Design a protein around this motif. Structure first.
Motif, PDB file in Angstrom:
ATOM      1  N   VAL A  10      14.237  51.600  56.033  1.00 19.01           N
ATOM      2  CA  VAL A  10      13.483  51.811  54.804  1.00 19.01           C
ATOM      3  C   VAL A  10      14.015  53.073  54.142  1.00 19.01           C
ATOM      4  O   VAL A  10      14.118  54.124  54.787  1.00 19.01           O
ATOM      5  N   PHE A  11      14.354  52.971  52.862  1.00 14.11           N
ATOM      6  CA  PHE A  11      14.848  54.099  52.087  1.00 14.11           C
ATOM      7  C   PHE A  11      13.844  54.459  51.000  1.00 14.11           C
ATOM      8  O   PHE A  11      13.205  53.579  50.413  1.00 14.11           O
ATOM      9  N   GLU A  12      13.700  55.758  50.746  1.00 15.82           N
ATOM     10  CA  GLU A  12      12.823  56.281  49.699  1.00 15.82           C
ATOM     11  C   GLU A  12      13.656  57.197  48.814  1.00 15.82           C
ATOM     12  O   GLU A  12      13.609  58.427  48.950  1.00 15.82           O
ATOM     13  N   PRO A  13      14.431  56.627  47.896  1.00 16.98           N
ATOM     14  CA  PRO A  13      15.361  57.440  47.106  1.00 16.98           C
ATOM     15  C   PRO A  13      14.640  58.391  46.164  1.00 16.98           C
ATOM     16  O   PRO A  13      13.575  58.086  45.623  1.00 16.98           O
ATOM     17  N   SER A  14      15.243  59.562  45.974  1.00 15.28           N
ATOM     18  CA  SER A  14      14.775  60.490  44.961  1.00 15.28           C
ATOM     19  C   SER A  14      15.022  59.910  43.570  1.00 15.28           C
ATOM     20  O   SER A  14      15.717  58.904  43.399  1.00 15.28           O
ATOM     21  N   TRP A  15      14.437  60.560  42.561  1.00 13.14           N
ATOM     22  CA  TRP A  15      14.701  60.149  41.187  1.00 13.14           C
ATOM     23  C   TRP A  15      16.181  60.268  40.850  1.00 13.14           C
ATOM     24  O   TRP A  15      16.708  59.461  40.076  1.00 13.14           O
ATOM     25  N   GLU A  16      16.866  61.255  41.430  1.00 13.99           N
ATOM     26  CA  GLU A  16      18.300  61.397  41.199  1.00 13.99           C
ATOM     27  C   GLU A  16      19.072  60.237  41.815  1.00 13.99           C
ATOM     28  O   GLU A  16      20.000  59.703  41.198  1.00 13.99           O
ATOM     29  N   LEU A  22      23.648  50.172  42.096  1.00  9.02           N
ATOM     30  CA  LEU A  22      24.924  49.895  42.749  1.00  9.02           C
ATOM     31  C   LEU A  22      25.475  51.133  43.443  1.00  9.02           C
ATOM     32  O   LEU A  22      26.008  51.048  44.556  1.00  9.02           O
ATOM     33  N   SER A  23      25.363  52.296  42.797  1.00  8.63           N
ATOM     34  CA  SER A  23      25.779  53.538  43.438  1.00  8.63           C
ATOM     35  C   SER A  23      24.944  53.819  44.679  1.00  8.63           C
ATOM     36  O   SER A  23      25.472  54.254  45.709  1.00  8.63           O
ATOM     37  N   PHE A  24      23.635  53.569  44.603  1.00  8.38           N
ATOM     38  CA  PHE A  24      22.768  53.846  45.742  1.00  8.38           C
ATOM     39  C   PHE A  24      23.024  52.869  46.884  1.00  8.38           C
ATOM     40  O   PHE A  24      23.057  53.270  48.054  1.00  8.38           O
ATOM     41  N   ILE A  25      23.209  51.586  46.564  1.00  7.27           N
ATOM     42  CA  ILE A  25      23.462  50.585  47.599  1.00  7.27           C
ATOM     43  C   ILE A  25      24.802  50.848  48.278  1.00  7.27           C
ATOM     44  O   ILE A  25      24.953  50.644  49.489  1.00  7.27           O
ATOM     45  N   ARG A  41      11.977  51.758  48.695  1.00  8.35           N
ATOM     46  CA  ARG A  41      10.747  52.103  48.001  1.00  8.35           C
ATOM     47  C   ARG A  41      11.079  52.967  46.797  1.00  8.35           C
ATOM     48  O   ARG A  41      11.575  54.090  46.971  1.00  8.35           O
ATOM     49  N   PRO A  42      10.830  52.504  45.577  1.00  7.09           N
ATOM     50  CA  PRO A  42      11.108  53.321  44.391  1.00  7.09           C
ATOM     51  C   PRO A  42      10.223  54.552  44.372  1.00  7.09           C
ATOM     52  O   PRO A  42       9.227  54.616  45.109  1.00  7.09           O
ATOM     53  N   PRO A  43      10.559  55.559  43.566  1.00  2.39           N
ATOM     54  CA  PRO A  43       9.629  56.678  43.373  1.00  2.39           C
ATOM     55  C   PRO A  43       8.279  56.166  42.893  1.00  2.39           C
ATOM     56  O   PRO A  43       8.198  55.212  42.118  1.00  2.39           O
TER      57      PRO A  43
END
Ligand SMILES: O=C(O)CCC(=O)C(=O)O
Ligand SMILES: [Mn+2]
Length: 294
Positions: A10-16, A22-25, A41-43
């Motif tokens: 499970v990932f909880e990425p920052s707003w950045e 595609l960059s995050f994946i 999980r989005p912000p």
């Protein structure tokens, strides 16, 4: 005595980190491709409004007999409201408790018991593979006519809007909708052309997933051949994938790594190239999915 597989990442990425999917994946790939599936999980401030036209939303769901394979050896048209009333009544009656008091692990164990049970026959319905062009996407979209609020324009333009994922493969498609109920399911499959898949749960009770990393794909297929019904043995994979339901514990005891997750409302699930996945719905929910490239 079903044994839940280990949980997928499970990932909880920052707003950045959430600005470019595609960059995050591509960044989480070293871990997520080793599990086949992952959850994002989005912000918490990222809350897209539900943009389907509810009034005119009519569909005839497919009927699913959970034990149809084990058995080898009346049709209704719904609105969204009437499907939810049917779905909640079914789950409430089945477990004899309010729908939100039923534990996800209990629905999970009961589901896999029913799949292999010849003694009692359970039949559910699934509004699966509903095209967004006939019905409208769950995400707000800009098309010149059909028309959106200022506060939701950011979601119509977000890269995490599934209508904005890249879908054109490279050489010399619109999202699909899924209206689920308790025990509605999808069997083991990979995507056409081994493409990525991303799934967003707009609202409702969780969607339970099982995933296999791509490096074990041939091992799953070999396990399928040896244990699937003999009549469906020689079928090509495109057709065999329509009926490849198999308990994840069967795969795990044969050495196939399986990961699970409960996709809750507002969360993304991403499946990686040639990652076999299957699952079922914990109750009344609404999901949207699309195949995307790169
Ligand atoms: O929710 C479903 O029934 C299927 C979803 C799926 O296969 C996917 O998102 O790749
Ligand atoms: Mn899929």
């Amino acid at each position: 005595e079903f044994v839940p597989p280990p949980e997928c990442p499970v990932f909880e990425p920052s707003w950045e980190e959430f600005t470019d999917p595609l960059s995050f994946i591509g960044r989480i790939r070293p871990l997520a491709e080793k599990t086949g599936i992952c959850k994002i999980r989005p912000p918490k401030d990222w809350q897209p409004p539900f943009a389907c036209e509810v009034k005119s939303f009519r569909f005839t769901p497919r009927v699913q007999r959970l034990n149809e394979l084990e058995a080898m050896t009346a049709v209704r048209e719904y609105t969204l409201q009437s499907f939810g009333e049917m779905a909640d009544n079914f789950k409430s009656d089945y477990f004899n408790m309010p729908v939100h008091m039923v534990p996800t692990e209990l629905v999970e164990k009961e589901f896999w018991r029913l799949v292999s049970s010849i003694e009692e026959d359970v039949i559910v319905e699934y509004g699966a593979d509903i095209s967004s062009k006939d019905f409208g996407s769950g995400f707000p979209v800009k098309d010149g006519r059909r028309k959106i609020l200022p506060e939701e324009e950011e979601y119509a333009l977000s890269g995490w809007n599934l209508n904005n994922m890249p879908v054109l493969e490279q050489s010399v498609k619109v999202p699909w909708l899924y209206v689920g109920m308790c025990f509605s399911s999808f069997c083991w499959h990979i995507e056409d052309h081994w493409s990525y898949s991303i799934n967003y749960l707009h609202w409702g009770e969780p969607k339970t997933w099982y995933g296999v990393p791509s490096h074990a794909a041939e091992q799953l297929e070999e396990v399928m051949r040896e244990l699937a019904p003999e009549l469906f043995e020689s079928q090509p994979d495109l057709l065999h994938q329509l009926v490849t339901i198999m308990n994840p514990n069967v795969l795990m005891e044969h050495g196939v790594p399986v990961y699970r997750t409960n996709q809750c409302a507002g969360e993304f699930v991403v499946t990686f190239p040639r990652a076999y996945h299957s699952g079922f719905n914990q109750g009344y929910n609404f999901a949207e999915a699309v195949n995307f490239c790169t």
